[PDB]
Amino acid sequence: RADVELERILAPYTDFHYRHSPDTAEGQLKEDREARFLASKMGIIATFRSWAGIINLCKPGNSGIQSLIGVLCIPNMEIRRGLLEVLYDIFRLPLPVVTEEFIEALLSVDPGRFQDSWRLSDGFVAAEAKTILPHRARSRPDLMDNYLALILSAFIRNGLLEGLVEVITNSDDHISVRATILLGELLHMANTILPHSHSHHLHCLPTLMNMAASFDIPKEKRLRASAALNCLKRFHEMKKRGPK
Amino acid sequence: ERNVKGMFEVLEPLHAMMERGPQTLKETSFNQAYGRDLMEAQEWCRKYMKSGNVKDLTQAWDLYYHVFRRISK
Amino acid sequence: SFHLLRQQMSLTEIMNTGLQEHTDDNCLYCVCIEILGFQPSNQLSMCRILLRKEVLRLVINLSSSVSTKCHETGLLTIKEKYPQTFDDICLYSEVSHLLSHCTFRLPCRRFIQELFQDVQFLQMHEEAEAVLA
Ligand SMILES: [Zn+2]
Numbered sequence: 001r002a003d004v005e006l007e008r009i010l011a012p013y014t015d016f017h018y019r020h021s022p023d024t025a026e027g028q029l030k031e032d033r034e035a036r037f038l039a040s041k042m043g044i045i046a047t048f049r050s051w052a053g054i055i056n057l058c059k060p061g062n063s064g065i066q067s068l069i070g071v072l073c074i075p076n077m078e079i080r081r082g083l084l085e086v087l088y089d090i091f092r093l094p095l096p097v098v099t100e101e102f103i104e105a106l107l108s109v110d111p112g113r114f115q116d117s118w119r120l121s122d123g124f125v126a127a128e129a130k131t132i133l134p135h136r137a138r139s140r141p142d143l144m145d146n147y148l149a150l151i152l153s154a155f156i157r158n159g160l161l162e163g164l165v166e167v168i169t170n171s172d173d174h175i176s177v178r179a180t181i182l183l184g185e186l187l188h189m190a191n192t193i194l195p196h197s198h199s200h201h202l203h204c205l206p207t208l209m210n211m212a213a214s215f216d217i218p219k220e221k222r223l224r225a226s227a228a229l230n231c232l233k234r235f236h237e238m239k240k241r242g243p244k
Numbered sequence: 245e246r247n248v249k250g251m252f253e254v255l256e257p258l259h260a261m262m263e264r265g266p267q268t269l270k271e272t273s274f275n276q277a278y279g280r281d282l283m284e285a286q287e288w289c290r291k292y293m294k295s296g297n298v299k300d301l302t303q304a305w306d307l308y309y310h311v312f313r314r315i316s317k
Numbered sequence: 318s319f320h321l322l323r324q325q326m327s328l329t330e331i332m333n334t335g336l337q338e339h340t341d342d343n344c345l346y347c348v349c350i351e352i353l354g355f356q357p358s359n360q361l362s363m364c365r366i367l368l369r370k371e372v373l374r375l376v377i378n379l380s381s382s383v384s385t386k387c388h389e390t391g392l393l394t395i396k397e398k399y400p401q402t403f404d405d406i407c408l409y410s411e412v413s414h415l416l417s418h419c420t421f422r423l424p425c426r427r428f429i430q431e432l433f434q435d436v437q438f439l440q441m442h443e444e445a446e447a448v449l450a
Contacts, residue, residue, distance in 0.1 A: 003276075011277040014273040022317065
Protein backbone atom coordinates (compact mmCIF):
# COMPACT_ATOMS: atom_id res chain seq x y z
CA ARG A 1 0.00 0.00 0.00
CA ALA A 2 0.95 3.63 -0.51
CA ASP A 3 1.37 5.48 2.80
CA VAL A 4 0.15 3.06 5.49
CA GLU A 5 2.48 0.02 5.44
CA LEU A 6 6.10 1.19 5.43
CA GLU A 7 5.32 4.34 7.43
CA ARG A 8 4.10 2.20 10.34
CA ILE A 9 7.66 1.80 11.65
CA LEU A 10 7.79 5.50 12.62
CA ALA A 11 4.44 5.38 14.45
CA PRO A 12 6.06 5.05 17.92
CA TYR A 13 7.56 8.52 17.40
CA THR A 14 4.73 10.26 15.54
CA ASP A 15 2.04 8.88 17.89
CA PHE A 16 2.57 10.29 21.39
CA HIS A 17 0.35 7.62 23.00
CA TYR A 18 1.25 4.57 20.91
CA ARG A 19 -0.21 1.18 21.87
CA HIS A 20 1.29 -1.65 19.83
CA SER A 21 -0.36 -4.67 21.43
CA PRO A 22 -4.07 -4.67 22.32
CA ASP A 23 -3.61 -6.92 25.38
CA THR A 24 -0.32 -6.52 27.26
CA ALA A 25 0.69 -6.75 30.90
CA GLU A 26 -0.11 -3.51 32.71
CA GLY A 27 2.95 -3.97 34.93
CA GLN A 28 5.45 -3.24 32.14
CA LEU A 29 4.45 0.03 30.47
CA LYS A 30 7.68 2.07 30.47
CA GLU A 31 10.02 -0.79 29.55
CA ASP A 32 7.66 -1.62 26.69
CA ARG A 33 7.83 2.02 25.60
CA GLU A 34 11.64 2.03 25.63
CA ALA A 35 11.69 -1.24 23.68
CA ARG A 36 9.33 0.25 21.09
CA PHE A 37 11.55 3.34 20.84
CA LEU A 38 14.67 1.22 20.35
CA ALA A 39 13.08 -1.02 17.71
CA SER A 40 11.62 1.94 15.81
CA LYS A 41 15.01 3.68 15.85
CA MET A 42 16.76 0.54 14.59
CA GLY A 43 14.23 0.30 11.76
CA ILE A 44 14.31 3.98 10.82
CA ILE A 45 18.12 4.08 10.65
CA ALA A 46 17.92 0.90 8.55
CA THR A 47 15.47 2.22 5.95
CA PHE A 48 17.74 5.22 5.30
CA ARG A 49 20.62 2.96 4.21
CA SER A 50 18.68 1.57 1.22
CA TRP A 51 17.61 3.50 -1.85
CA ALA A 52 14.11 2.00 -1.88
CA GLY A 53 13.64 3.45 1.61
CA ILE A 54 15.25 6.83 0.97
CA ILE A 55 13.08 7.38 -2.11
CA ASN A 56 9.88 6.05 -0.52
CA LEU A 57 10.26 8.09 2.68
CA CYS A 58 11.18 11.39 0.98
CA LYS A 59 8.49 11.39 -1.72
CA PRO A 60 7.29 14.90 -2.67
CA GLY A 61 3.79 14.22 -1.28
CA ASN A 62 2.69 13.91 2.34
CA SER A 63 5.70 11.70 2.96
CA GLY A 64 6.91 10.10 6.19
CA ILE A 65 9.96 12.33 6.51
CA GLN A 66 7.91 15.53 6.92
CA SER A 67 5.85 13.88 9.66
CA LEU A 68 9.15 13.10 11.41
CA ILE A 69 10.32 16.73 11.25
CA GLY A 70 6.92 18.16 12.18
CA VAL A 71 6.72 16.23 15.46
CA LEU A 72 10.20 17.52 16.29
CA CYS A 73 8.80 21.08 16.40
CA ILE A 74 6.32 20.19 19.17
CA PRO A 75 7.45 20.80 22.78
CA ASN A 76 7.26 17.18 23.96
CA MET A 77 10.45 16.52 25.93
CA GLU A 78 10.15 12.72 25.52
CA ILE A 79 9.75 12.39 21.75
CA ARG A 80 12.03 15.38 21.17
CA ARG A 81 14.91 13.81 23.12
CA GLY A 82 14.53 10.50 21.28
CA LEU A 83 14.41 11.91 17.76
CA LEU A 84 17.78 13.58 18.32
CA GLU A 85 19.43 10.18 18.84
CA VAL A 86 18.00 9.01 15.51
CA LEU A 87 19.23 12.17 13.82
CA TYR A 88 22.65 11.65 15.42
CA ASP A 89 23.08 8.04 14.31
CA ILE A 90 21.57 8.68 10.86
CA PHE A 91 24.45 11.04 9.99
CA ARG A 92 27.02 8.84 11.79
CA LEU A 93 27.91 11.55 14.30
CA PRO A 94 29.19 10.90 17.84
CA LEU A 95 26.79 11.59 20.69
CA PRO A 96 27.81 14.12 23.37
CA VAL A 97 27.32 13.52 27.08
CA VAL A 98 23.99 14.30 28.75
CA THR A 99 24.68 17.69 30.36
CA GLU A 100 23.18 21.17 30.61
CA GLU A 101 26.27 23.26 29.77
CA PHE A 102 27.55 23.50 26.20
CA ILE A 103 31.23 23.62 27.20
CA GLU A 104 31.10 20.11 28.70
CA ALA A 105 29.31 18.40 25.80
CA LEU A 106 31.56 20.16 23.29
CA LEU A 107 34.55 18.50 24.95
CA SER A 108 33.03 15.01 24.65
CA VAL A 109 32.75 15.25 20.84
CA ASP A 110 36.40 16.25 20.37
CA PRO A 111 37.82 14.22 17.44
CA GLY A 112 41.03 13.87 19.48
CA ARG A 113 39.55 12.53 22.73
CA PHE A 114 41.24 9.53 24.31
CA GLN A 115 39.99 6.08 23.31
CA ASP A 116 40.60 2.64 24.79
CA SER A 117 42.29 1.47 21.58
CA TRP A 118 45.18 3.91 22.07
CA ARG A 119 46.55 2.17 25.18
CA LEU A 120 49.98 0.57 25.02
CA SER A 121 48.54 -2.93 25.43
CA ASP A 122 45.89 -2.47 22.74
CA GLY A 123 46.95 -0.15 19.93
CA PHE A 124 49.80 1.96 21.23
CA VAL A 125 50.67 4.46 18.48
CA ALA A 126 49.52 2.94 15.17
CA ALA A 127 45.84 3.02 16.14
CA GLU A 128 46.17 6.54 17.56
CA ALA A 129 47.80 7.91 14.40
CA LYS A 130 44.92 6.60 12.28
CA THR A 131 42.36 8.75 14.10
CA ILE A 132 44.19 12.09 14.36
CA LEU A 133 46.37 12.02 11.24
CA PRO A 134 44.41 12.34 7.97
CA HIS A 135 44.32 9.96 5.03
CA ARG A 136 46.77 10.47 2.17
CA ALA A 137 44.01 10.54 -0.48
CA ARG A 138 42.95 14.01 -1.63
CA SER A 139 41.02 13.14 -4.82
CA ARG A 140 39.48 9.70 -4.20
CA PRO A 141 35.66 9.74 -4.50
CA ASP A 142 34.86 8.42 -0.98
CA LEU A 143 31.31 7.25 -1.70
CA MET A 144 30.44 7.79 1.98
CA ASP A 145 30.54 11.54 1.33
CA ASN A 146 28.20 11.06 -1.64
CA TYR A 147 25.67 9.18 0.49
CA LEU A 148 25.88 11.65 3.37
CA ALA A 149 25.47 14.61 1.00
CA LEU A 150 22.38 13.05 -0.57
CA ILE A 151 20.86 12.36 2.86
CA LEU A 152 21.69 15.86 4.13
CA SER A 153 20.20 17.50 1.04
CA ALA A 154 17.03 15.42 1.37
CA PHE A 155 16.76 16.45 5.03
CA ILE A 156 17.44 20.15 4.41
CA ARG A 157 14.84 20.22 1.61
CA ASN A 158 12.10 19.23 4.08
CA GLY A 159 13.06 21.91 6.61
CA LEU A 160 15.37 20.28 9.14
CA LEU A 161 17.36 23.40 10.03
CA GLU A 162 14.25 25.36 11.00
CA GLY A 163 13.11 22.47 13.18
CA LEU A 164 16.53 22.29 14.82
CA VAL A 165 16.41 26.03 15.52
CA GLU A 166 12.94 25.68 17.05
CA VAL A 167 14.27 22.84 19.22
CA ILE A 168 17.26 24.97 20.23
CA THR A 169 15.20 27.96 21.35
CA ASN A 170 11.93 26.54 22.73
CA SER A 171 13.06 23.55 24.78
CA ASP A 172 14.96 22.50 27.90
CA ASP A 173 18.72 22.82 28.38
CA HIS A 174 19.44 19.07 28.22
CA ILE A 175 17.94 19.09 24.73
CA SER A 176 19.14 22.58 23.75
CA VAL A 177 22.78 21.54 24.14
CA ARG A 178 22.31 18.39 22.04
CA ALA A 179 20.43 20.25 19.32
CA THR A 180 23.06 23.01 19.22
CA ILE A 181 25.79 20.40 18.78
CA LEU A 182 23.81 18.62 16.06
CA LEU A 183 23.25 21.92 14.25
CA GLY A 184 26.95 22.72 14.46
CA GLU A 185 27.90 19.31 13.06
CA LEU A 186 25.40 19.64 10.21
CA LEU A 187 26.57 23.17 9.38
CA HIS A 188 30.17 21.93 9.28
CA MET A 189 29.24 18.99 7.05
CA ALA A 190 27.38 21.35 4.70
CA ASN A 191 30.39 23.49 3.77
CA THR A 192 32.46 20.32 3.29
CA ILE A 193 30.37 17.86 1.26
CA LEU A 194 27.65 20.00 -0.29
CA PRO A 195 27.92 21.83 -3.63
CA HIS A 196 28.26 25.59 -3.42
CA SER A 197 24.69 26.37 -4.51
CA HIS A 198 23.32 24.05 -1.83
CA SER A 199 25.46 25.54 0.96
CA HIS A 200 26.06 29.22 0.14
CA HIS A 201 22.88 30.41 1.91
CA LEU A 202 22.81 27.92 4.80
CA HIS A 203 25.35 29.80 6.95
CA CYS A 204 23.04 32.83 7.17
CA LEU A 205 20.57 31.08 9.52
CA PRO A 206 17.79 33.64 9.01
CA THR A 207 15.28 32.21 11.51
CA LEU A 208 17.85 32.32 14.33
CA MET A 209 19.50 35.65 13.48
CA ASN A 210 16.16 37.43 13.13
CA MET A 211 15.26 36.07 16.58
CA ALA A 212 18.60 37.09 18.12
CA ALA A 213 18.17 40.62 16.70
CA SER A 214 14.47 41.26 17.39
CA PHE A 215 13.77 43.43 20.45
CA ASP A 216 9.98 42.91 20.29
CA ILE A 217 9.85 39.22 21.32
CA PRO A 218 10.40 38.33 25.01
CA LYS A 219 13.98 38.81 26.13
CA GLU A 220 14.51 35.16 27.08
CA LYS A 221 14.17 33.96 23.48
CA ARG A 222 16.49 36.70 22.19
CA LEU A 223 19.14 35.91 24.80
CA ARG A 224 19.01 32.16 24.21
CA ALA A 225 19.26 32.75 20.45
CA SER A 226 22.35 34.91 20.99
CA ALA A 227 23.81 32.23 23.26
CA ALA A 228 23.13 29.62 20.57
CA LEU A 229 24.96 31.75 18.00
CA ASN A 230 27.92 32.11 20.38
CA CYS A 231 28.00 28.34 20.94
CA LEU A 232 27.87 27.75 17.18
CA LYS A 233 30.87 30.03 16.72
CA ARG A 234 32.70 28.18 19.50
CA PHE A 235 31.95 24.85 17.81
CA HIS A 236 33.26 26.23 14.51
CA GLU A 237 36.49 27.30 16.22
CA MET A 238 36.82 23.83 17.74
CA LYS A 239 36.29 22.29 14.29
CA LYS A 240 38.88 24.50 12.60
CA ARG A 241 41.39 23.78 15.37
CA GLY A 242 41.77 20.09 14.54
CA PRO A 243 42.68 16.91 16.41
CA LYS A 244 45.82 17.14 18.54
CA GLU B 245 -29.92 -6.56 15.88
CA ARG B 246 -28.16 -8.40 13.01
CA ASN B 247 -28.45 -5.17 11.00
CA VAL B 248 -25.57 -5.13 8.53
CA LYS B 249 -27.24 -2.34 6.55
CA GLY B 250 -27.13 -0.31 9.77
CA MET B 251 -23.50 -0.80 10.73
CA PHE B 252 -22.58 -0.11 7.10
CA GLU B 253 -24.16 3.35 7.15
CA VAL B 254 -22.75 3.87 10.65
CA LEU B 255 -19.11 3.32 9.69
CA GLU B 256 -19.14 4.46 6.06
CA PRO B 257 -18.81 8.20 6.92
CA LEU B 258 -15.69 7.32 8.92
CA HIS B 259 -14.02 5.65 5.94
CA ALA B 260 -15.19 8.59 3.81
CA MET B 261 -13.59 11.21 6.05
CA MET B 262 -10.48 9.02 6.33
CA GLU B 263 -9.85 8.81 2.56
CA ARG B 264 -9.68 12.59 2.05
CA GLY B 265 -6.22 12.65 3.63
CA PRO B 266 -4.93 13.56 7.07
CA GLN B 267 -4.51 17.30 7.56
CA THR B 268 -2.81 17.52 10.99
CA LEU B 269 0.01 15.69 12.75
CA LYS B 270 -2.42 13.78 14.98
CA GLU B 271 -4.38 12.62 11.93
CA THR B 272 -1.18 11.61 10.14
CA SER B 273 -0.06 9.61 13.18
CA PHE B 274 -3.45 7.90 13.34
CA ASN B 275 -3.23 7.11 9.63
CA GLN B 276 0.24 5.62 10.14
CA ALA B 277 -0.81 3.52 13.14
CA TYR B 278 -4.33 2.25 12.36
CA GLY B 279 -4.59 3.21 8.69
CA ARG B 280 -3.63 -0.16 7.21
CA ASP B 281 -6.16 -2.30 9.09
CA LEU B 282 -9.06 0.08 8.43
CA MET B 283 -8.43 -0.28 4.68
CA GLU B 284 -8.37 -4.08 4.55
CA ALA B 285 -11.45 -4.12 6.79
CA GLN B 286 -13.29 -1.91 4.30
CA GLU B 287 -12.07 -4.17 1.49
CA TRP B 288 -13.52 -7.21 3.27
CA CYS B 289 -16.81 -5.41 3.95
CA ARG B 290 -16.99 -4.51 0.26
CA LYS B 291 -16.25 -8.10 -0.77
CA TYR B 292 -19.09 -9.22 1.50
CA MET B 293 -21.56 -6.61 0.24
CA LYS B 294 -20.73 -7.73 -3.32
CA SER B 295 -21.30 -11.46 -2.69
CA GLY B 296 -23.23 -12.09 0.51
CA ASN B 297 -21.15 -14.41 2.69
CA VAL B 298 -20.51 -14.04 6.43
CA LYS B 299 -17.08 -15.60 5.85
CA ASP B 300 -16.08 -12.21 4.41
CA LEU B 301 -17.62 -10.13 7.22
CA THR B 302 -15.93 -12.14 9.98
CA GLN B 303 -12.45 -11.03 8.88
CA ALA B 304 -13.57 -7.41 8.56
CA TRP B 305 -14.91 -7.58 12.11
CA ASP B 306 -11.68 -9.22 13.27
CA LEU B 307 -9.73 -6.22 11.96
CA TYR B 308 -12.28 -3.75 13.34
CA TYR B 309 -12.14 -5.34 16.80
CA HIS B 310 -8.33 -5.35 16.82
CA VAL B 311 -8.31 -1.64 15.98
CA PHE B 312 -10.98 -0.99 18.62
CA ARG B 313 -9.06 -2.83 21.34
CA ARG B 314 -5.88 -0.94 20.47
CA ILE B 315 -7.70 2.42 20.52
CA SER B 316 -9.56 1.83 23.79
CA LYS B 317 -6.31 1.32 25.73
CA SER C 318 -29.92 -19.52 5.79
CA PHE C 319 -29.14 -21.51 8.93
CA HIS C 320 -27.17 -18.66 10.50
CA LEU C 321 -30.39 -16.62 10.78
CA LEU C 322 -32.47 -19.60 11.90
CA ARG C 323 -30.10 -20.31 14.79
CA GLN C 324 -30.67 -16.81 16.22
CA GLN C 325 -34.23 -17.53 17.36
CA MET C 326 -34.18 -21.36 17.53
CA SER C 327 -32.15 -23.13 20.21
CA LEU C 328 -30.31 -26.45 19.94
CA THR C 329 -32.35 -28.71 22.24
CA GLU C 330 -35.63 -27.58 20.67
CA ILE C 331 -34.46 -27.99 17.06
CA MET C 332 -33.38 -31.57 17.83
CA ASN C 333 -37.07 -32.55 18.02
CA THR C 334 -25.39 -32.42 3.69
CA GLY C 335 -24.41 -29.58 6.04
CA LEU C 336 -21.08 -28.88 4.31
CA GLN C 337 -21.20 -25.73 2.19
CA GLU C 338 -17.84 -25.69 0.38
CA HIS C 339 -17.30 -29.44 0.08
CA THR C 340 -16.53 -31.05 -3.29
CA ASP C 341 -14.73 -34.18 -4.46
CA ASP C 342 -11.61 -32.03 -4.71
CA ASN C 343 -10.43 -30.22 -1.53
CA CYS C 344 -11.55 -33.13 0.68
CA LEU C 345 -8.97 -35.29 2.45
CA TYR C 346 -10.77 -38.53 1.55
CA CYS C 347 -13.03 -37.80 -1.43
CA VAL C 348 -10.10 -36.97 -3.73
CA CYS C 349 -8.91 -40.59 -3.51
CA ILE C 350 -12.14 -42.25 -4.68
CA GLU C 351 -11.58 -41.41 -8.35
CA ILE C 352 -7.76 -41.39 -8.50
CA LEU C 353 -6.99 -44.35 -6.22
CA GLY C 354 -10.33 -46.17 -6.38
CA PHE C 355 -11.34 -45.55 -2.78
CA GLN C 356 -14.61 -47.09 -1.67
CA PRO C 357 -17.31 -44.43 -1.19
CA SER C 358 -17.93 -42.92 2.23
CA ASN C 359 -20.28 -44.83 4.51
CA GLN C 360 -23.61 -43.53 5.78
CA LEU C 361 -23.27 -42.09 9.27
CA SER C 362 -25.45 -43.19 12.20
CA MET C 363 -30.93 -35.87 9.53
CA CYS C 364 -29.87 -36.42 13.14
CA ARG C 365 -26.25 -35.76 12.13
CA ILE C 366 -26.67 -33.31 9.23
CA LEU C 367 -27.82 -30.73 11.80
CA LEU C 368 -24.89 -31.03 14.22
CA ARG C 369 -22.57 -30.76 11.20
CA LYS C 370 -23.78 -27.32 10.15
CA GLU C 371 -24.05 -26.36 13.83
CA VAL C 372 -20.36 -27.00 14.48
CA LEU C 373 -19.61 -25.33 11.14
CA ARG C 374 -21.43 -22.12 12.08
CA LEU C 375 -19.78 -22.24 15.51
CA VAL C 376 -16.28 -22.49 14.02
CA ILE C 377 -17.25 -19.70 11.61
CA ASN C 378 -18.35 -17.41 14.44
CA LEU C 379 -15.10 -18.28 16.24
CA SER C 380 -13.23 -16.33 13.52
CA SER C 381 -14.39 -12.80 14.41
CA SER C 382 -12.66 -13.06 17.82
CA VAL C 383 -15.46 -10.96 19.33
CA SER C 384 -16.83 -13.55 21.79
CA THR C 385 -14.53 -16.57 21.84
CA LYS C 386 -15.46 -17.94 25.28
CA CYS C 387 -19.11 -18.57 24.38
CA HIS C 388 -18.28 -20.39 21.14
CA GLU C 389 -15.50 -22.37 22.83
CA THR C 390 -17.98 -23.48 25.50
CA GLY C 391 -20.52 -24.41 22.83
CA LEU C 392 -17.94 -26.51 21.01
CA LEU C 393 -16.93 -28.16 24.29
CA THR C 394 -20.55 -29.04 25.11
CA ILE C 395 -21.05 -30.44 21.60
CA LYS C 396 -17.95 -32.60 22.04
CA GLU C 397 -19.12 -33.76 25.48
CA LYS C 398 -22.68 -34.63 24.44
CA TYR C 399 -21.89 -36.30 21.08
CA PRO C 400 -18.24 -37.40 20.90
CA GLN C 401 -19.02 -39.01 17.54
CA THR C 402 -19.74 -35.81 15.59
CA PHE C 403 -15.97 -35.19 15.52
CA ASP C 404 -15.31 -38.49 13.72
CA ASP C 405 -16.39 -37.85 10.11
CA ILE C 406 -13.27 -36.89 8.15
CA CYS C 407 -15.51 -35.10 5.66
CA LEU C 408 -16.10 -32.52 8.41
CA TYR C 409 -12.43 -32.27 9.41
CA SER C 410 -11.67 -31.60 5.74
CA GLU C 411 -14.25 -28.80 5.74
CA VAL C 412 -12.99 -27.17 8.94
CA SER C 413 -9.40 -27.41 7.69
CA HIS C 414 -10.36 -25.80 4.38
CA LEU C 415 -12.01 -23.10 6.50
CA LEU C 416 -8.86 -22.65 8.60
CA SER C 417 -6.87 -22.35 5.35
CA HIS C 418 -9.00 -19.41 4.16
CA CYS C 419 -9.73 -17.30 7.28
CA THR C 420 -7.89 -15.34 9.97
CA PHE C 421 -8.04 -17.26 13.25
CA ARG C 422 -6.01 -16.29 16.29
CA LEU C 423 -3.35 -18.68 17.55
CA PRO C 424 -5.15 -19.98 20.69
CA CYS C 425 -8.45 -20.39 18.83
CA ARG C 426 -6.65 -22.17 15.98
CA ARG C 427 -4.88 -24.49 18.41
CA PHE C 428 -8.17 -25.26 20.17
CA ILE C 429 -9.92 -26.02 16.87
CA GLN C 430 -7.09 -28.27 15.72
CA GLU C 431 -7.04 -30.04 19.10
CA LEU C 432 -10.78 -30.75 19.04
CA PHE C 433 -10.18 -33.30 16.26
CA GLN C 434 -7.18 -34.90 17.98
CA ASP C 435 -8.51 -38.02 19.74
CA VAL C 436 -10.19 -39.32 16.60
CA GLN C 437 -9.77 -42.66 14.82
CA PHE C 438 -10.73 -42.25 11.12
CA LEU C 439 -10.90 -46.03 10.76
CA GLN C 440 -12.53 -46.25 7.33
CA MET C 441 -9.83 -44.25 5.53
CA HIS C 442 -7.08 -46.37 7.10
CA GLU C 443 -8.91 -49.57 6.14
CA GLU C 444 -9.43 -48.43 2.55
CA ALA C 445 -5.77 -47.40 2.31
CA GLU C 446 -4.67 -50.83 3.52
CA ALA C 447 -7.08 -52.44 1.03
CA VAL C 448 -5.89 -50.42 -1.98
CA LEU C 449 -2.29 -51.03 -0.89
CA ALA C 450 -2.23 -54.84 -1.08
ZN1 LIG D 1 -15.46 -35.67 1.54
